[PDB]
From a paper:
The dimer from crystal Monocl-1, once known, was simply placed in the unit cell of Monocl-2 with the same coordinates; the two helices in the dimer were rigid body-refined and then subjected to restrained refinement. Although the movement of the two monomers within the dimer toward one another is slight, it significantly increases the interactions between them. As in Monocl-1, the hydrophobic stack interaction at one end of the dimer is fully maintained, but the opposite end of the dimer shows the two monomers pressed more closely together.
Apolipoprotein C-1 (APOC1) is a 57 amino acid polypeptide of Mr = 6.6 kDa that is synthesized predominantly in the liver of mammals. This small protein is remarkable for being the most positively charged protein in the human body, with a lysine content of 17%. The protein has a high affinity for lipid surfaces, particularly chylomicrons, and both HDL and VLDL particles.
Residue numbers in the entry:
A (entry chain B): 2 to 57
B (entry chain A): 5 to 55
The structure:
Amino acid sequence: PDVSSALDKLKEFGNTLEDKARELISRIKQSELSAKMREWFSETFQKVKEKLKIDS
Amino acid sequence: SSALDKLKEFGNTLEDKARELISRIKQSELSAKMREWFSETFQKVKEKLKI
């Protein structure tokens, strides 16, 4: 058996998990930006419609 | 934007569990290396002392 190789494997895993978890956070923030901009485009076009409509 | 802000807490949770895991692996490592070392030392002492 290889107790030393097993532990080193887990440190490797542990260290990657910690770095990828940080990267997950950034992908969430990207979709957040996406979702918020979709909300903003719709809202603002809604306003445009209304403003023209109440002016023919 | 609910699914996002609490998914962020998810990232933070994974990050903390990662660190914790590493801390624990290192402690296991120290423990095993001390166990091997003590055992080897005792063994050599035994041999030099003819039981």
